[PDB]
Design a protein around this motif. Structure first.
Motif, PDB file in Angstrom:
ATOM      1  N   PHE A  76       0.769  -1.241   0.000  1.00 32.86           N
ATOM      2  CA  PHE A  76       0.000   0.000   0.000  1.00 32.86           C
ATOM      3  C   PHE A  76       0.799   1.289   0.000  1.00 32.86           C
ATOM      4  CE2 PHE A  76       0.139  -0.947   4.571  1.00 32.86           C
ATOM      5  CZ  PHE A  76       0.517   0.265   5.105  1.00 32.86           C
ATOM      6  N   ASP A  77       0.179   2.273  -0.625  1.00 27.53           N
ATOM      7  CA  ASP A  77       0.536   3.648  -0.439  1.00 27.53           C
ATOM      8  C   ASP A  77      -0.761   4.342  -0.076  1.00 27.53           C
ATOM      9  OD1 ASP A  77       3.094   2.943  -1.254  1.00 27.53           O
ATOM     10  OD2 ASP A  77       2.880   3.966  -3.250  1.00 27.53           O
ATOM     11  N   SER A  84       5.004  -0.631   4.429  1.00 24.63           N
ATOM     12  CA  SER A  84       3.950  -0.510   3.426  1.00 24.63           C
ATOM     13  C   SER A  84       3.734  -1.840   2.641  1.00 24.63           C
ATOM     14  CB  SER A  84       4.229   0.725   2.550  1.00 24.63           C
ATOM     15  OG  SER A  84       3.571   0.735   1.294  1.00 24.63           O
ATOM     16  N   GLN A 102       4.551   1.275  -6.603  1.00 25.18           N
ATOM     17  CA  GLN A 102       4.376   2.047  -5.385  1.00 25.18           C
ATOM     18  C   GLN A 102       5.725   2.547  -4.896  1.00 25.18           C
ATOM     19  OE1 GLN A 102       2.223   0.108  -2.196  1.00 25.18           O
ATOM     20  NE2 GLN A 102       0.626  -0.678  -3.641  1.00 25.18           N
ATOM     21  N   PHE A 103       5.737   3.377  -3.877  1.00 24.96           N
ATOM     22  CA  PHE A 103       6.996   3.938  -3.374  1.00 24.96           C
ATOM     23  C   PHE A 103       7.857   2.779  -2.881  1.00 24.96           C
ATOM     24  CE2 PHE A 103       3.939   7.422  -1.872  1.00 24.96           C
ATOM     25  CZ  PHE A 103       3.840   7.924  -3.131  1.00 24.96           C
TER      26      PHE A 103
HETATM   27 MG   LIG Z   1       4.367   1.863  -0.153  1.00 22.57          MG
END
Ligand SMILES: [Mg+2]
Ligand SMILES: [Mg+2]
Lengths: 106, 288, 288, 105, 287, 286
Positions: free
Chosen positions: A10-11, A41, D38-39
DNA sequence: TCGTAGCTGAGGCCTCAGCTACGTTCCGTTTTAGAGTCATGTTGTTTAGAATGGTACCAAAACCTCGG
DNA sequence: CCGAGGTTTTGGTACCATTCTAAACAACATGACTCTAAAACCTCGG
DNA sequence: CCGAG
DNA sequence: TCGTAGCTGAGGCCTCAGCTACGTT
């Protein structure tokens, strides 16, 4: 054996007070469901069969926080075991193994 | 359902947090999700644990075993309320007819004797195996003729020699006893989950011990333990013990499917209970 | 074997030293010799305890009871090699005759109705109080006429008005329910201590109520709660809650003596059980 | 048939050298045609196993030797089963296995 | 590389970090250069940088330019398709007139066979055998113009005796378009081996700069013919889109299902080796 | 068709409007009618251009040339439907006779040797300068005797001492090599403009610009001068001083001209002589 | 209206230690609908990993040509 | 007639990109069980 | 009937 | 010597706009 892994990434936004709260709730959910933090995350959950997997997917839609980007990937234990650690130490926590018998101590 | 057997034998503090069992030793720390756990086995006397943890263990239907100063098991947690509607089954259990109990009990012991024979056959004692089948055919309700006992004495002498009795202090008996206790605990748990009292056995009903009914139900499964210790007859007790955990790891044929032992025990128990309740006919069969 | 019932409900650590149970709370300490203990009752989920202690408790065949987050019992330790004498009670309980149960139950409910009346009298409802006494005099075994229910309806309408039902989401009902659950738990705990199953009521026989028998025993005590809630009927729920703890702080007349409630419940329960077992005659009486 | 290489990292930032080490590695990822999913989480489409072994090789060559960095190989089919619990699917061309692409149409 | 990138929106193309960068007012795309096989610029509303073009030429990416009607009109021609480019040139200049004849005629034979196979495919068993006959009568550099007779027959059979191959219609437009795509593929491959495309086997330098590519693409023409035939009743814009199947699909070649650009590479390299007299059998492509 | 060679080497945007090429730089703006243009040469990598422009350039069959980050050419647009006249040159180049190549190459090398000598003279080596002129007089076609190479070795030893070889790793050679590359690129660009291929040279190593190396030969001393004058300096300074080549003017055909302009005229004429359309190689001297 | 490489500081993501506040809200009974569990088996499809066939390129064997 | 030396054809290893194929797999099928809420029933004095 | 048991 | 729920602020991860310097001009 029949085991699979559910990989969840997730972000999630943090600007607002409500979307922070929304996050804290979701993470709490994940921990309580027995997901384990692989990286920040990014979380993984060991599952016994596909039956269990369908059930967890169901629970996930029920606790959808409706914010950010949240993404799931299913793979066999065998596939996950082929994960390559380019650097950093492997995760030797019991929670991250398939082992039916565990000794704490010994 | 749940599938791990967690063995604790290090000086440690067990606690509960966020649906996890929390294990803290001076060096190391482990969290284990409660839904993953089938059995919690507390081998040593150097462990602290919280009542919250125990509550939560009882909620999930986790078999918790306590041990001695010599690492032998000595007791189990016995939940009072194994299911949402436990009152219902209790009334049914009290109404079990003496005839129906006889039918079921005798059916069950027959299965034990068959499995004792099959095990003998397995070890190339073709002859004594047939002998047991004969004792089985002679069985009448509640076995007024020890046929069970005659069969067992023969069975054990042929396996461990005519010098052997099952009361003598040795590694083989210790191993058998330990294994039999594991089995007992599995079926004690399952019974309570279906809403029965374990104190009320089919033949002796609470006269001697508080788990008579569990002993009755586990009978056909005893040879599973017998096999394992026979194969390790010459080993030390500590090895016998570790080999016995195979019972939870392995799978066995039951009703055309290969199933884990705890799952078999659940189905087996539920169906035995249905037959005792006269909701169905035909005791389920387990053969090795 | 021993004679003490040790009740733990404070955040604490239990351990074993020198054949003593060791109780450590932040406030104080206690050491208690193991041979003095009959029962160890763990009421709350804020307790740590060691496996050494548990082993030694099992050695002595001390009855160890576990409770949940609402102080209701949920299980006990089951030794594999002996029995606390509480095990004998089950057989006795199964043998309770339908007549004896009727006598005891009806006696008990009579006490409840009397106490409902006395409470009405207390609030200067001289007239409706006499009305309840009338309903009581007409009571037959197991109350087929539902005199209990008609008495209750009248009682509550008089106290909280004819617009009041027990199912409306009031602060008053919330308070009543909460208080009643406190009482339930007291008697559930006392019953399991004597070796009885709470699932098996005298007249309460609801398949979902795991505590039918507790509900039966607590009946005469309900008005204690009713009094408190009535006196705070205009207050908020949080205050009602706090005022309800007076049950544990106050003393009540019981057998010619001012006693604390938990102590009364113990004596009351033990004696009710003895009279059901036909070991004595004469149900104990509690009046407000 | 196509593969995806999924690369995830957590890399330290305390020191100046840690930071430099990071910037270099990320630069390499971008230049190799990894895409930010994503990051800290990147994916790369690959054609054959030849290409995959080759990329793995290049990765060891530019290993920054810091933090935790993990790789997962999966079939395009597996990746395509990815479930978006929330947020929008990534319809960038770079993320598709289409041989014919249209920037327009 | 394996992608065909088609640009037909008002946009700015640029280069950053080994990516092609596409910027339109709406949205923005980055595409890794190593992924790209062909860049097709359909419209006249596109800006692009010379850096991008350099880098496109480095990677060996086929770049196509189009006019106002979205027909192609040219391509980038790299000067230096190799670092070893001098070596092949000298060899190419030394190609003997007899070997060129052998190779050219071998190639045209393959084209005629494929024209026939295509006719067979459309249940013209009869005219198919006719082409095979024209093929058997081929001699070096086809003085008799068997190629041209075969083609006229082939096309009349497919599109009727009313049909010329010079008439202004959707079918020819489609054919021409498809043929240009092919041309570009082989032009690229030739340059990549170090050959000049201006120098054809039959006519060198004659009325155009890609003669050698036209020569090499001959056997492949039916691939486009098939597609247009199957869409002969469609509009041109549909014909056009269907033609991109050439880059998506796979074709049997040397016992394997291969993509067309890859075939064209192997085919070209081997034709060049045979012209150089480094090996004998001309490679064969059949539909 | 047209007559202008348009050279762009500044950061700029090219576009099309009203039959004009539109050139926009931050400094300058120009509109140029398309019919006036023969060749469009894009020297640098800092240029934007539109596809409309390209279409219209292709319509007119304007020769469009692309260059890399060093300003060497790397490709051209190839129209599908016609030809810039530059296409005819290839045929002519292939037909260059071995004799004619020898004449032109040897003429050229002579000019180089002359200029090497003039440079030596310039540094008050009156004596070794005459020596080179002697080597020049002894030249025969394709220089079988290697008079070029002997002249060069002598020339360089005199300038940088007898310990010096041109293969040693040092600042002087680095500087020379760099300067020579600049020159190379100028002539590479000019050759492709005329329609020639730069790969195969007049004499003789697989370099892609052999022919450019051949043409640049007389100009080498221009670099030599600059490096000699800064022989004691660091390489980064040498590099910057070398850009004087583009800023300065040199005598050529009786007038002071910029180097790039000279190279254009020089190249065009050398090609004409190789094609046997003209007699008399053009001459460049310091 | 080109690129690269490198660093910095602003600002958003993400976790965690640390703080405060809170902590038993049914009991006439049985029926039924519904959402939530579950571990096994069954079936064709997908996949990892090694074989293949068509290459290059380079030691071998076999082939050859004198001289004893 | 032998083999020395050298000149040739031959067959070997080492390389790719496809293709093959034994093994792993996803997705559905099966045949249940558990707990919860709400709604149904009980008697009979306002 | 409601609604207490 | 027990848990939960909720929020906060400290501090580490992660990206990005924006800056400088450089480039056979
Ligand atoms: Mg992330
Ligand atoms: Mg990360």
């Amino acid at each position: 054996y029949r085991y699979m892994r559910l990989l969840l990434m997730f972000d999630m936004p943090t600007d607002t007070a409500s979307d922070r709260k929304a996050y804290r709730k979701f993470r709490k959910f994940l921990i309580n469901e027995g997901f384990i933090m692989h990286q920040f995350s990014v979380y993984s959950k060991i599952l016994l069969n596909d039956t269990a997997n369908k059930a967890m997917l169901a629970r996930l839609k029920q606790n959808n926080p409706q914010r950010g980007l949240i993404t799931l990937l299913n793979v066999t234990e065998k596939q996950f075991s082929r994960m390559i650690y380019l650097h950093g130490e492997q995760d030797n926590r019991v929670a991250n193994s398939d082992e039916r018998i565990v000794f704490l101590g010994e | 359902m749940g599938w791990r057997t967690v063995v604790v034998n290090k000086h440690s503090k067990l606690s509960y947090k966020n649906n996890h069992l929390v294990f803290k030793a001076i060096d190391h720390q482990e969290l284990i999700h409660l839904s993953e756990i089938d059995v919690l086995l507390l081998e040593t006397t150097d462990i602290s644990l919280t009542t919250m943890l125990l509550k939560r263990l009882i909620d999930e239907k986790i078999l918790v075993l306590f041990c001695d100063d010599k690492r032998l098991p000595i007791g189990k947690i016995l939940p009072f309320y194994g299911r949402h509607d436990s009152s219902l089954q209790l009334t049914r259990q009290l109404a079990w007819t003496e005839e129906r109990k006889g039918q079921v009990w005798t059916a069950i012991i027959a299965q034990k004797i068959t499995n004792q024979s099959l095990h003998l056959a397995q070890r190339d004692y073709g002859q004594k195996a047939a002998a047991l089948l004969a004792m089985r055919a002679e069985l009448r309700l509640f076995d007024p003729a020890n046929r069970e006992g005659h069969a067992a004495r023969s069975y054990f002498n042929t396996l461990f020699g005519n010098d052997f009795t099952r009361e003598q202090e040795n590694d083989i008996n210790a191993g058998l006893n330990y294994g039999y206790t594991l089995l007992l605990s599995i079926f004690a748990r399952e019974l309570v989950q279906t809403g029965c009292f374990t104190q009320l056995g089919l033949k002796h009903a609470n006269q001697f011990n508080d788990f008579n009914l569990a002993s009755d139900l586990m009978e056909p499964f005893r040879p599973l333990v017998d096999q394992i210790i026979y194969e390790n007859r010459k080993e030390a007790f500590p090895i016998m013990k570790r080999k016995l955990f195979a019972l939870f790891m392995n799978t066995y044929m039951y009703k055309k499917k290969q199933m884990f032992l705890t799952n078999i025990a659940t189905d087996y128990t539920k169906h035995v209970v249905k037959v005792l309740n006269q909701e169905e006919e035909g005791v389920p069969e387990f053969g090795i």
